[PDB]
Point group: C3
Chain length 231, copies 3
């Protein structure tokens, strides 16, 4: 484990995702509202999945070597197995908050799968220049997601209860800022141009992951928007 | 790329799926009917997924070598990753058109997963004679799907609006004819008996894919069956 | 095939899953109740999936070698591909029986995916002591599932029709007893401590699989709880 300088950030990430999972699990014990139960189930699964994948990276299972640039490059593939399941769950939290229609939910989840799937292909591609073709396709899929979150959901939240509109607006802004950083870290990190070393890259993804999952969840599960209007 | 004679058909397929995706995306911009939005989302995702997998084959990522018959045989595995997601989406288009019940939808999607999954196992199997055992199981799963589309959905469409009944009947006939060709191309192509060479096999799958996805989508999204009855 | 002593139990399992699939398929022909159709579709898919994965193990495709303990250990990875899809389908049978809320269904299916996913990682892990870390995480996920089936569903079934309450109680008890045996067989078998040899381990999993899928299905599909109350 300790033979890799980035191990400290993988261990911290593992701990923070595990602690986040347990807090949400305990906090959700005393909840019977069927609407609130939906948000607790979605939001608790997110850091639980991330916990297992951070642990796999810490123990060395989620790491492979990819030859490109005449070098064997360490690629943590477990990140994409994490994101494949956690990013659509996070979008479902937002879509259920605004009572989005089914067709829009399917478009979001499908574009998200394309985003993560093409990012994985780009991470494992051995022809250096082709890695950035996949990065560009994946980034186009992300821009579609961000467009929908702004010019489809925002207008839908305003016609909703005030507390669900204000909570959505906050979580929307958090998501757009944090998610946009991921393609940048990829491009300048060891998967892309190799400007930033792997140990610093790992620290950046850990800050982003914890903020986008545990920070996101703390804002959502403390809001009254997750409960139905009741007397 | 150009070192493979089949590259021209992979490049054409990539272009036609990309163009198809963009047309459906633009055409769906001016749509607010929640029913129509469902069909546009399903139908636009189909060629978008196929685009990415054709590109992976063009660039050489979606290709592996499988030893059988005393030879290293080029097997494009990316086809099955495509079909795993696009064939159930196409069946969902048909099932939603006739307002099929949930139990029937699950049976269709499950049989479809078995069809594609066993076809993938057959494509990667190293014992030559066993490849055709998997082909037979996969073909049995397809025949179940075709039976349901005829002796379960057809009777359901007649009790529906006339425009949804006539549109379903057309898309049903297109699907049964085109899908039935796939097991035949597999059997006589490089995955099976090896009668037809890979470059011709690739041309045939490209014609079938574009017809079953973009041609299918053009018929559906030009129909009024996708809109609810409104004044 | 016959070069492996466990082949006899893989062949028996294949036959019993295939026969089970055909019986459920025939029995479900004469069913039009939309509620009953749901249970028949879920319950017939379970042994059909298991059939294909037992066949892959029989023919040698679903087997790999994992080095640990200074030895190349035969690991049947196809079991986890089976369980990944069949265990959530079995939980869906139970959840639909008691009309569970959506949030609870998602929590069950998500915990089940974590259970199977971490068990697969543990089966393929090359550092011997780490294999049991994954076993423990997977077992914690199972205990969560069992808790929900007892202290969330049981109370919900009592407020239901008497026949659905008594049928659920029976299937609940069958599930908790049979599922609990799996982590024990893993721990003492070739994936874990290696006390029980592989051929005996394979026999035990076959008895458990057939009971948990075909036996489970025979109890459910003979009950009147799967039909709506009708005159
Ligand atoms: C009902 O809706 C509320 C349940 O949602 C919340 C239910 C959760 C979604 C269930 C998923 C958690 C499982 C219990 C998994 C247990 C293993 C975890 C990875 C444990 C990690 C923390 C600890 C080991 C440090
Ligand atoms: C509606 C939305 C959900 C739609 C989703 C969008 C999606 C279509 C976007 C594209 C996804 C696609 C790129 C997934 C590729 C997975 C692949 C990286 C797995 C590893 O295989 C890659 C190479 C080794 O580098 O295999 C070496 C050769 C091996 C012999 C490969 C044989 C196994 C194949 C991988 C079998 C295909 C399985 C499916 C891809 C499983 C789904 C994986 C997940 C990442 C989507
Ligand atoms: C709301 O419902 C309508 C949206 O459906 C339609 C929405 C679509 C389903 C969203 C999926 C498309 C994404 C925007 C993916 C973008 C990358 C594409 C693969 C681009 C391919 C064409 C071009 C690069 C040649
Ligand atoms: C309700 C419906 C959706 C049900 C679906 C029906 C489905 C059950 C039908 C059978 C599907 C099954 C054959 C999928 C097999 C995937 C497999 C080809 C992936 C590549 O692995 C094959 C060998 C190399 O040749 O791995 C070499 C050895 C490696 C060490 C393998 C270890 C990884 C395992 C593959 C882990 C299992 C992952 C799941 C199979 C992922 C789903 C893939 C998709 C193709 C279903
Ligand atoms: C409508 O709801 C009822 C259909 O459910 C029941 C429908 C089933 C869920 C459909 C799935 C079965 C498919 C027909 C697959 C056929 C291949 C099987 C694996 C055959 C195995 C048995 C035989 C080959 C020994
Ligand atoms: C809501 C719920 C459904 C959530 C589900 C819970 C889930 C997150 C729990 C953890 C699942 C995770 C451990 C799955 C790992 C699959 C992995 C074993 C496949 C084989 O790859 C392992 C190594 C060889 O030993 O690959 C060698 C290196 C290769 C180069 C690997 C590159 C391919 C990657 C495997 C791509 C990721 C694909 C996804 C993991 C596909 C889903 C598989 C299924 C088992 C979940
Ligand atoms: C909890 C994890 C989250 C919210 C991860 C989000 C990840 C992304 C938005 C990743 C995007 C990428 C691109 C847009 C292209 C480059 C490759 C990716 C996958 C890093
Ligand atoms: C857009 C792609 C489509 C509609 C693909 C359809 C593919 C099939 C219907 C494939 C069927 C197969 C068999 C029936 C057995 C032989 C292997 C397959 C997977 C080619
Ligand atoms: C039809 C198959 C069924 C119902 C299989 C159930 C399997 C389990 C409940 C497996 C559980 C495991 C653990 C709890 C940890 C050890 C590894 C597993 C996956 C065997
Ligand atoms: C979206 C965030 C990207 C900003 C990356 C900042 C990295 C600064 C760290 C110093 C770079 C290390 C280079 C010298 C080793
Ligand atoms: C009462 C609110 C705080 C509860 C404690 C939460 C502990 C989980 C770890 C959170 C750290 C990361 C927060 C986002 C920066
Ligand atoms: C379902 C369509 C299958 C028909 C295949 C027709 C192939 C004819 C092309 C000529 C065969 C090439 C053999 C000589 C190289
Ligand atoms: C107005 C209808 C035609 C629009 C142009 C569609 C261009 C997408 C490519 C379609 C070619 C394949 C059609 C099926 C044979
Ligand atoms: C949950 C069931 C686990 C019980 C396992 C009993 C196995 C007894 C078979 C004899 C053990 C073989 C050891 C000598 C070869
Ligand atoms: C009339 C009920 C029996 C029908 C025959 C079922 C045959 C399928 C194989 C069942 C054997 C396994 C039963 C569970 C132990
Ligand atoms: C194995 C991959 C299957 C999933 C394909 C994605 C489409 C799923 C459609 C689900 C239809 C709704 C069923 C109720
Ligand atoms: C990782 C594979 C999980 C999918 C298994 C297929 C069954 C899914 C059941 C979904 C139940 C409906 C939830 C609302
Ligand atoms: C185009 C939709 C408007 C909202 C999206 C904001 C774009 C942020 C740019 C992200 C940069 C990634 C490289
Ligand atoms: C048996 C259901 C009737 C409709 C299915 C038509 C069968 C077409 C044969 C396809 C040939 C594939 C080898
Ligand atoms: C803790 C929830 C109560 C019901 C679960 C029964 C636990 C059975 C123990 C299984 C042993 C697996 C190692
Ligand atoms: C080795 C660098 C080659 C540059 C390729 C950049 C491709 C980016 C595509 C974005 C449209
Ligand atoms: C090398 C050819 C061996 C023939 C096997 C055919 C199997 C087909 C099974 C269809 C029932
Ligand atoms: C080689 C045996 C090492 C023992 C590790 C046991 C780990 C079990 C963790 C359960 C909390
Ligand atoms: C609940 C605390 C979980 C912390 C265990 C993971 C941290 C790795 C320490 C080496
Ligand atoms: C929108 C046009 C997309 C065409 C790019 C793919 C074709 C491959 C050319 C080499
Ligand atoms: C319907 C009977 C299915 C039996 C075939 C599988 C058994 C393997 C025999 C070698
Ligand atoms: C993106 C930063 C999240 C901050 C988490 C703190 C929330 C406390 C209510
Ligand atoms: C299967 C052939 C499809 C033909 C596509 C043309 C549709 C234009 C309306
Ligand atoms: C767990 C044992 C199941 C027994 C199956 C027999 C059911 C006949 C109704
Ligand atoms: C009005 C809410 C502002 C939230 C933005 C937070 C950016 C990290
Ligand atoms: C909408 C604000 C985008 C912020 C992008 C930050 C990328 C590091
Ligand atoms: C009555 C519609 C006929 C459609 C069949 C088209 C076959 C390619
Ligand atoms: C229902 C007509 C089937 C046509 C099969 C064509 C196979 C090449
Ligand atoms: C295995 C075939 C079953 C025969 C019919 C059983 C009575 C519905
Ligand atoms: C009251 C029903 C008892 C069922 C338990 C069966 C254990 C195999
Ligand atoms: C609730 C009874 C548990 C039985 C466990 C059996 C494990 C072999």
């Amino acid at each position: 484990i300790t033979g890799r300088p980035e191990w400290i950030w993988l261990a911290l990430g593992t701990a923070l995702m595990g602690l986040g999972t347990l807090y949400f699990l305990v906090k959700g014990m005393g909840v019977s509202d069927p609407d609130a139960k939906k948000f607790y189930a979605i939001t608790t699964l997110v850091p639980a999945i991330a916990f297992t994948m951070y642990l796999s990276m810490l123990l060395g299972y989620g790491l492979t070597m990819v030859p490109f640039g005449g070098e064997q490059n360490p690629i943590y593939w477990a990140r994409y197995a994490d994101w494949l399941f956690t990013t659509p769950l996070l979008l479902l939290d937002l879509a259920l908050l605004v009572d989005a229609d089914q067709g829009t939910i399917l478009a979001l989840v499908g574009a998200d799968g394309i985003m993560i799937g093409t990012g994985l292909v780009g991470a494992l591609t051995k022809v250096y220049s082709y890695r950035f073709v996949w990065w560009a396709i994946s980034t186009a899929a992300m821009l579609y997601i961000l467009y929908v979150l702004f010019f489809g959901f925002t207008s839908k939240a305003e016609s909703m209860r005030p507390e669900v509109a204000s909570t959505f607006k906050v979580l929307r802004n958090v998501t757009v800022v944090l998610w946009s950083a991921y393609p940048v870290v990829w491009l300048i990190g060891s998967e892309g141009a190799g400007i930033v070393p792997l140990n610093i890259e790992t620290l950046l993804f850990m800050v982003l992951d914890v903020s986008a999952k545990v920070g996101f969840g703390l804002i959502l599960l403390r809001s009254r928007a997750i409960f139905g209007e009741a007397e």
